[PDB]
């Protein structure tokens, strides 16, 4: 179909080589064919297009700057779809650029065409796809490749007029999705000079078309990048001479003067040509020159002055913020709305944002610019899938109160303070997929800056957790981790600037930002930092103590506590007494019970004994409140567990002694009072979480109990398989496997650990030779083993608990501190009375301050980082730019003085 | 160039062979051999220095590797070579011992990915084992994955050590009878397994503390079996009897192992 | 602990994927039955690798210094070509 149409339209000796496309063409051919041919047979059309001069030198010398820029360059094309035309040789800078094709199509998207000449090239066999495996080598390590149809063969090239004709006309036509202005850019790259490379040069002036050549290499290139540096013919003659001495000595004196005529067509017009100076710079470059090569040619054309847009569209694809900056946004000319608007929507989309931040500086109303429709239509078409997958991960396993909220949100736009909060969703936007340039810019933007901060943090460590891949994760876990200090050092600025102010921002409930204030979220992402700050802790210290002043010694206010048992009033509201007193209502309940338990406990439970169910229906209806409060939040905590379970336990021996059938009942109700009084009891250990020098200890004391926990398997393997010996090799048989265990169980599990088996070696010829060994690795080789094996574990645990102490306290006091909040201020024991009695009844200037000390914080960090290092070196340049200015005057003003 | 410690001779030839990280790893494995000889003490710092840098130049190498794409890294990861040194990657690692390479976490990746096989991650284990028991086609996939074979596995010898607990403490009179034949047919799969293992690596099966173990334990079980079968006296049952116990706490403490698994 | 876990998930590898007590049967079957691309994309990553390392290593800390010996080599010549045409004006 297509090959027989090219054949009848040239009218073939053409072939699908492959050892990819090779064609024929006439030096008459129609250029539009060919851009005919390539658009609608093998190729998308191309919004960028670069022409790299060929044939130059035979031999390429793979040096670094010139390796590493054509690599950018190719990357670069892949990105943007671009195609390249080269030569095609197999010697020289086309084959590196074959391969560098090849690695990046294994690593399809790039299209790189070659340019031939039919009579030069090797012998190829006529048509189908003939293969060719080896006066002129050709690499077919492009794409596609097309030779030219000369008549004669012949060594000079016989075909730059298809290469200018193909590009001048490519250039003749419109591409409206490209940034350019309704045109193809076209862009030379001459980084090998050379005789026919010259004369490209100067027809590519008369095409109008931009050319950039490469400085400090190349045979010629090197000779154009110093003459840049009115017209003389001396002058631009001199150089090129010295320069190349083998060159000019094999030309002839004819060629010389046709030479320095076009290096004077090249000084015709500056505008065109660009340098690329190598010797200096980064990456950037390779992107850079290009896109500078483009804008000047925008700008030469008077319709494309005219608008801005054209201007402002281009440097934005490209990304060369100084360009746009200084030469547009600097005109000063009215800038309207809607001119931003639509450059911010296409900017928020290519990720850039340095133009984000450009545009919000030159003026642009966020809050105007996030409509709904701007909002759904981000988050349903440009939102990533994986993203949303890892979101669907996290809300089936690790699902949480923030993460619901967050994806409740994600849902409602998809498919669809003020109460829209349209920066939250943005900044939530770009969290979820760790933009972390764009995210930074937009944080600035937004009101209560630290919760947004403690919430972003929360969100990507519960992100992070997900599984589902692994390159994301660490992304979104470094994102959390700059998110924490940023708020840590936001909050600790804001609290000593002014304190009464920081207390309000800290507890300032949102407007549904997540549905909570700033600790709540520092809280549940358990970050001990945060809060071990001084100003938390100051904070909760005036909680707890309330109305008391500190620095009050608190033996003081423990004995005014009972010598004193209006202005008391205050002094009956403050936390810290209220606990006081709950804790001595507690201790004597704990009395009570054990009078009643150990005295009193006849068939007739009589005062004594129902005092005690009256207080403990007392502590019930306080922890069903407490359960009525928070309907999973309740079973989260362990204490809640331990309390539930003395419920129980309390209940059973209610039932027991009630039905007092048979005085065995009685008795096991009795038990079962006692084992409930030692659960009872042991919830006092809570209290001693109010001392610093007590607090350590329990949550020591309870990383050590999951240690146990860990070595209860080891001990319960190595207890069956030597329980099981023992049974089997001590005695013969038993009142089955129970009574043989029973039997001496008690001793292995207790006794070793209290004294040595004395009988046990008595009680034991092969049975006696063997008999020694079964003990002797029994006992003193794994039981001594094992116990040393956890004694190790609790020093450790100890050790790195008490090494990290004064910060796990503040942390957990914060939980003691928030309990005593939601309670009625009231004693234990009478605050039944209020439950009844509430049972009965029941049937800005803040942000803005946040805002200025946000200001403060940036300047200190922005400024301190930046100008500080970079003073010295800009000192240098301006020094040295300012004298070189001097001089070059001083140089012009001798001259004209002789 | 590595065998003579010629640094940058080797760092320029490194750069020209395909394969780069395997051959990266491979050079550090070597120069720490050879550092190991005490024949001349000079030469042996520069080559312990030199194998202490190829090791951080692989280690960079296969983390950037992984975090420019997952699938290919993986499938780099356990590419045999044509006979480089006859290994991939992966065995060089552990040969040399390395490890940091291992703790990385694309490697931990790969390996979860095996473990797991089918079943997807982020999957709370209370679940697939909940799974297990509630349901003893797609269920093939989920009966494939080596988290579930191992799981099995562990039940298995649960219930073996729990027979052979039983069989010793109760029924071991002369005649042996079905509880105790029937021990005999699973110690015979042990014994089978282990001799497969034995016969894959000749060498490789005794380095293992763990099949010294087994064996050991295969040891005794036989002489138990001899002493009751002669039943020659009663002292001679007694004797096979307390080996049985000696060879049951052999048996029951190769249980540890499979606590590995878990963090 | 991730190295230790090496060994416990190779050594699953090899298995026949079968629970133990029944794999007796597979092993009498098995009795009775007996009687390029990726080194290029590794290449192009080392590619990027060492370009990472060398001109962080060298460009980032000799760039002030090259700037410094340019604009001084740069100023020098100038100043000679300066002397050069002053003297001709005389
Ligand atoms: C055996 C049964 C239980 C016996 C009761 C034993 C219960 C029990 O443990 O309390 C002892 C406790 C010890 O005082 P404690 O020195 O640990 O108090 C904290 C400690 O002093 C810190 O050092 C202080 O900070 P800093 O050093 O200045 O930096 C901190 O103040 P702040 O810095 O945060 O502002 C203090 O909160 O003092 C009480 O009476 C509390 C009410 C107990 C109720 C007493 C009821 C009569
Ligand atoms: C007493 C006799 C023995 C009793 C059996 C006791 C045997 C036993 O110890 O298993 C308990 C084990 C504990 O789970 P465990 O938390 O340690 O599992 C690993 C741990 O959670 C890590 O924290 C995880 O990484 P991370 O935290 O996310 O970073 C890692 O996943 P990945 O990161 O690598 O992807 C997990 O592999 O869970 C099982 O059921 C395993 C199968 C057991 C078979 C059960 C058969 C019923
Ligand atoms: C019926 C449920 C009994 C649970 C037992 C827990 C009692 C806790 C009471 P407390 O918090 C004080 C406020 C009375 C104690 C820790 C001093
Ligand atoms: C006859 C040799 C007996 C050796 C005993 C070792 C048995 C190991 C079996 P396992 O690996 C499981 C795959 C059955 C055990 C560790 C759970
Ligand atoms: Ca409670
Ligand atoms: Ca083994």
């Given at each position: ?21 090779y064609?024929?063409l ?19 059309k ?29 990357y ?8 390249i ?42 048509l ?13 390590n ?9 008549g ?25 999705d ?13 980084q ?36 840049v ?73 008077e ?10 569209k ?10 746009a ?9 009215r ?19 340095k133009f ?15 409509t ?31 993460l ?15 109460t ?17 340039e764009?995210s ?38 470094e ?8 708020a ?19 507890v300032?409930?949102?407007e ?37 002043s500190?620095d ?29 007193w ?19 406990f ?18 019930f ?87 146990v ?39 292995p ?37 094992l116990?040393n ?28 501190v928030?309990?005593y909040?939601?309670?009625l ?15 009965v ?58």
């Amino acid at each position: 179909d297509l090959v027989n149409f090219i054949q009848a339209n040239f009218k073939d000796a053409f072939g699908d080589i492959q050892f990819g496309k090779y064609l024929r063409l006439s030096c008459d051919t129609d250029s539009e064919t060919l851009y005919e041919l390539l658009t609608q047979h093998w190729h998308l059309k191309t919004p960028n297009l670069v022409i790299s001069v060929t044939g130059g030198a035979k031999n390429f010398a793979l040096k670094p700057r010139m390796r590493k820029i054509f690599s950018r360059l190719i990357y670069i094309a892949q990105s943007k779809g671009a195609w390249i035309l080269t030569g095609g040789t197999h010697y020289g800078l086309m084959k590196y650029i074959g391969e560098v094709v090849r690695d990046n199509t294994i690593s399809e998207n790039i299209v790189a065409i070659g340019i031939a000449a039919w009579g030069m090239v090797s012998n190829r066999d006529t048509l189908f796809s003939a293969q060719y495996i080896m006066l002129y080598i050709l690499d077919n390590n492009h794409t596609h490749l097309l030779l030219v149809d000369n008549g004669c063969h012949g060594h000079p090239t016989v075909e730059a007029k298809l290469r200018n004709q193909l590009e001048k006309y490519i250039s003749e036509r419109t591409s409206q999705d490209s940034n350019y202005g309704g045109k193809i850019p076209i862009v030379c790259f001459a980084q090998g000079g050379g005789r026919e490379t010259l004369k490209a040069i100067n027809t590519s002036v008369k095409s109008k078309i931009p050319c950039v050549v490469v400085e400090g290499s190349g045979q010629i290139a090197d000779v154009i990048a110093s003459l840049v540096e009115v017209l003389t013919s001396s002058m631009v003659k001199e150089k090129l001479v010295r320069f190349l001495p083998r060159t000019v000595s094999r030309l002839p004196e004819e060629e010389i003067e046709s030479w320095i005529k076009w290096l004077k067509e090249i000084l015709e017009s500056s505008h065109l040509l660009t340098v690329i100076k190598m010797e200096e710079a980064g990456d950037e470059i390779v992107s850079n020159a290009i896109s500078y090569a483009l804008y000047k040619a925008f700008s030469t054309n008077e319709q494309d002055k005219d608008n801005w847009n054209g201007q402002l569209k281009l440097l934005l694809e490209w990304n060369q913020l100084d360009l746009a900056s200084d030469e547009i946004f600097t005109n000063d000319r009215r800038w309207e709305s809607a001119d931003l608007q639509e450059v911010m929507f296409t900017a928020l989309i290519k990720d850039r944002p340095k133009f984000v931040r450009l545009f919000l500086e030159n003026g642009l109303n966020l809050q105007k610019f996030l409509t709904n429709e701007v909002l759904t239509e981000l988050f349903s078409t440009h939102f990533s899938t994986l993203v949303y997958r890892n979101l669907q991960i996290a809300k089936n396993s690790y699902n949480d109160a923030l993460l619901t909220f967050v994806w409740k949100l994600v849902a409602n736009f998809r498919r669809s303070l003020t109460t829209r909060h349209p920066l939250q969703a943005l900044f939530i936007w770009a969290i979820l997929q760790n933009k972390k340039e764009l995210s930074k810019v937009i944080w600035e933007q937004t009101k209560g800056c630290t919760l947004a901060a403690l919430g972003a943090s929360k969100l990507l460590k519960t992100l992070a957790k997900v599984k589902n891949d692994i390159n994301a994760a660490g992304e979104s876990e470094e994102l959390a981790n700059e998110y924490e200090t940023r708020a840590v050092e936001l909050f600790t600025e804001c609290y000593s600037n002014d304190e009464d102010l920081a207390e309000q921002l800290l507890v300032y409930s949102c407007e549904a930002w997540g549905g909570s204030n700033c600790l709540e979220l520092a809280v549940e992402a358990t970050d001990q930092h945060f809060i071990a700050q001084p100003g938390v802790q100051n904070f909760l210290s005036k909680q707890w103590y309330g109305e008391i002043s500190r620095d009050t010694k608190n033996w003081k206010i423990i004995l005014c506590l009972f010598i004193i048992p209006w202005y008391y009033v205050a002094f009956f509201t403050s936390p810290f007494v209220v606990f006081s007193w709950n804790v001595v209502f507690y201790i004597a309940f704990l009395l009570l019970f054990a009078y009643v338990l150990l005295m009193d406990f006849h068939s007739v439970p009589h005062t004594p004994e129902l005092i005690l169910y009256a207080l403990v229906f007392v502590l019930f209806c306080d922890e069903v409140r407490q359960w009525y409060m928070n309907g999973v939040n309740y079973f989260t905590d362990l204490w809640n567990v331990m309390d539930t379970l003395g419920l129980f336990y309390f209940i059973a021996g209610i039932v027991f002694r009630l039905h007092s059938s048979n005085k065995s009942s009685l008795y096991s109700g009795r038990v079962i009072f006692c084992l409930d009084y030692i659960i009872f009891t042991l919830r006092l250990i809570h209290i001693f979480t109010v001392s610093r020098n007590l607090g350590p200890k329990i949550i020591m004391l309870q990383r050590m109990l999951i240690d146990v926990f860990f070595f209860l398997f080891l001990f319960a393997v190595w207890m069956v398989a030597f329980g099981v010996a023992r049974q089997g090799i001590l005695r013969q048989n038993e009142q089955r496997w129970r009574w043989i265990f029973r039997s001496v169980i008690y001793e292995p599990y207790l006794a070793m650990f209290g004294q040595v088996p004395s009988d046990v070696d008595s009680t034991t010829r092969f049975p006696e030779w063997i008999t020694i060994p079964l003990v002797c690795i029994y006992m003193l080789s794994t039981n001594i083993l094992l116990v040393n094996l956890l004694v190790a574990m609790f020093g450790y645990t100890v050790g790195i608990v008490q090494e990290n102490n004064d910060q796990v306290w503040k942390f957990q006091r914060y939980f003691l501190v928030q309990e005593y909040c939601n309670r009625l201020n009231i004693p234990f024991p009478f605050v039944v009375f209020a439950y009844f009695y509430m049972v009965v009844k029941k049937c800005n200037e803040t942000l803005a301050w946040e805002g200025v000390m946000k200001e403060n914080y940036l300047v200190k960090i922005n400024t301190k980082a930046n100008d500080n290092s970079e003073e010295m070196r800009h000192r240098f340049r301006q020094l040295d730019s300012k004298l070189n200015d001097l001089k070059s005057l001083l140089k012009e003003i001798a001259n004209n003085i002789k």
